[PDB]
């Protein structure tokens, strides 16, 4: 589901770094290495915000309490 704060391998918290990295590919034209601007020196806590699936923005469109 959500980006897993406090990555497994590293001890760095990353949960903050999701929308801040999303709007780097989105409108900054830089490729995935925009995370280098984020400061993930390793590859360990690096490979999370890179290949994380944010499926929950698609699961949330399922409120039966949508009143519509």
């Amino acid at each position: 589901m959500i980006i897993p704060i406090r990555c497994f391998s590293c001890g760095k918290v990353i949960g903050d770094k999701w929308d801040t990295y999303l709007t780097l590919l989105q409108e900054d034209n830089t490729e995935g290495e925009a995370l280098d601007k984020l400061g993930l020196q390793r590859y360990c806590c690096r490979r999370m915000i890179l290949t994380h699936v944010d499926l929950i923005e698609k699961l949330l469109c399922y409120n039966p309490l949508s009143k519509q």
């Binding site: 409120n63 039966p64 309490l65 949508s66 009143k67 519509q68």
Partner: protein
Amino acid sequence: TMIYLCADCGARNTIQAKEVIRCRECGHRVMYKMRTKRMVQFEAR
């Protein structure tokens, strides 16, 4: 009574025991129970 959720219409129905079950506003025949406020405690593990 009990308060439920019309599945499609999404309308509180306030149905009572031993009663025909259907949405009152749209007519749907499937309804969930709302989640009341009930104390539950968890460990962070």
